[model samples]
Target: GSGSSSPLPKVAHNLGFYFSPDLTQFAKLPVELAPHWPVVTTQNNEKWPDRLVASLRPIHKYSRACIGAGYMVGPSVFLGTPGVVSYYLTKFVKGEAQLLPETVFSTGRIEVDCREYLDDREREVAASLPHAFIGDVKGCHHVTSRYLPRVLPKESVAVVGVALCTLTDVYLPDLEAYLHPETQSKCWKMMLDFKEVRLMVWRDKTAYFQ
Candidate 1:
């Protein structure tokens, strides 16, 4: 729902938390199999594990990003032993047992809501990138640090929400080989969605008001 006035108050505050990977366990895996482990996204396409390793090689080799990316692997896959699918799925999915460390992967979070100082227009801009903003062209405000207090009253209402996502990056040579084909293009659309959410925090820092 749109707010009644132009400048609104901060109604809520949301906090999102994501931890860096722990490399201790990753060190235990055999060097040859290291590239095959899952790091993000759960839809393991058989070849996913190996592909993930290759993608991260540059990062790992240069110590550019943290190791041990987190992710999810569906119960139908990655269970290792066969026939006990029902037990593993029920226990893991239902939160009845501790998750196997090998299967545990990447993590991130998103925080959203409202702010009192932001009007509907400002809120819309904040919620989405310029490329995504579509509505009546009202106007925009440049939210400067000094003017925030005066432009935004202390008593405005804001709406906020946060989502924490767990992911497992898999490697699939067959999938990589198809990256240029039409099927890969379709599959990549979903990947873009995941990347968008993963970078929300970075996006929030640069938003402008007008």
Candidate 2:
């Protein structure tokens, strides 16, 4: 990205990020090794747990990695799909208090760990005002801090707060070779033609997921 010239928003509400997965990477593994790892899956359209917001279905807010996304993942993962994040930021921020990851943001595949990025106070403040904790997209702003880390880079790959569009109407051939129609639709609507995906600090949850 050319690094957007936009400005980071002031302290306010909340936000979250996640990285999805797909079948293409899993199918390569023989069933003997991947069995019981759902091949094709669909939305449950059921109730969600505490600290999570429900979209087409409930979601998993905080995650440690792709394999840890739990239900947010399809048969295996949300690979390249961007749904919503179930943020833990319920309160607002105060002064120069840098933000913390309400759900412990992961840099995913990036060289930086970012998990240890925040101190004690910022961590607590981040939980209350999650979005406020996030810096700008890589070059999108001049915030100077990178709260959320990179989860998608070159290769494809979180939470349970943001929402997934109805994910209707998709027309792509050869896609089924890797993902089911349902999963394909969701991922197809996510970030495309890019890598090293991150957040924009706008809280749209549009490009947050990897």
Candidate 3:
């Protein structure tokens, strides 16, 4: 939901952590993407389909990847920030995850509880966000930087993800945890209700709304 058609919503927020991916692992060519009897056609002594194959790698050269997940806590979707959600939502709506069977779509909705580690200033900003601000979107990128205070009273964090989210349930992390040689606890994790959360991708390529 990070494209121009998709709006950045303030009332909703999600966090995602991503890493690289390899297509050859536990995968196959989806029939929809490949022809039944693909004949090798040469242009500049170069094959036809293979050229497209080369396109698969970022620039027909070398490519890496991204694994993303995000959510809107509401029954429908106030949704999350334009950024983090943008990665996962883009993949979901593009049907980027699913191409064949035995394989599945990495896009869908899942009931989840996300823990956002926010400083006191972050909590203040989150609470001040609009309530029930839905059916539309905004720029609000300024909130991520301009509106946030530089320091915090306690120098700790909390989770205030949605309009419904407030400073009731909170957590404090170890100040020296990063320096500790061994640590087994997680500061926050977006617990999933399923193996992968599937969601819809919205795209509007028109000037009317803009």
Candidate 4:
């Protein structure tokens, strides 16, 4: 639906501070997006595609914007709800490589979009998975109102923004384990800049659809 009407600015700004690799501030957000491990069986063997790993490497290792892959899931994962899908699709044009708080916050649009795609069944699946909660409730409220909510409209924007901001600050050593190898490889082939794109586009397109 091309959700937002205002040409969702290509660059997100905060106060007088424009976000950049050097100038970005990091905020702590909750981790609610869960890990979706398929049922392990002789047929599936818990083996993900090699492409998953390859695709994730660049974003995992190179992108200054992304901190690491989120480990939480469900409604609480993005906006604030316990479990609902939200969608933020404008990021494709904004670029997910700048590690600025504004850029990271803006990326919430991606999460919002992701939440929207999950139907009732998918939401349940996401809710049941393991996820990380931002331990600081007060901080969550502060960031949401002070930064995220002001810029984003989706209910979950604040929560999702904080989470992504925290991610940009954390250090990730072995992203391979978190990101399946097969998915990585597929991402590399697609030329997508962010790891989330693989999950949102390629995986759903080829893995789930098939």
lDDT of 2 by residue, 96-182 (tens): 112333222221211122233223443343344333323323221111124334342323212211121111101111112223232
Better of 1 and 3 by lDDT: 3
Per-residue CA lDDT of model 3 for 1-210, tens digit only, reads 221211112111122211111122112344343233221111111221221111111212122111222222222332233123222221111212222111111111111223343356434533443221112232111123232343423223222332211111111121112212243422222222111221111222100011
Residue 11 miss distance in model 4 (angstroms): 5.3
* Candidate 3 regions with alpha-carbon error over 4 angstroms: 1-112, 115-122, 130-210
Error of 4 at 139 (Å): 7.4
How many backbone clashes does every candidate have? 42, 20, 7, 46
Model 4, 61-180: lDDT tens digits are: 232222222222222222322222122212211222223122222323244333231235423432332121222221222121223233435443323222223211111111122223
Which parts of model 1 are misplaced by more than 4 Å? 1-28, 35-49, 53-107, 110-210
The alpha-carbon deviation from the true structure for residue 57 of candidate 1, after best TM-score superposition, in angstroms, is 11
Considering only N, C-alpha and C atoms within 3 Å, which residue pairs clash in candidate 3? 107-198, 107-199, 108-197, 108-198, 108-199, 109-198, 109-199
Candidate 2 TM-score over all chains jointly: 0.17
In order, candidate lDDTs are 0.20, 0.22, 0.22, 0.22
What number of backbone clashes does candidate 3 have, counting pairs of residues 3 or more apart or in separate chains?
A: 7
Q: Comparing 1 and 3 by TM-score, which wins?
A: 3
| Candidate 1 residue-wise lDDT, 1-210, digit = tens | 211110000100001111102122122334444234422211112333322211212222221122222211221122111111111110111212222222211111111111131234434433444321111121112221212233333233221111111212111111222222332212222221112122111122221111
TM-score per prediction, in order, is: 0.16, 0.17, 0.19, 0.19
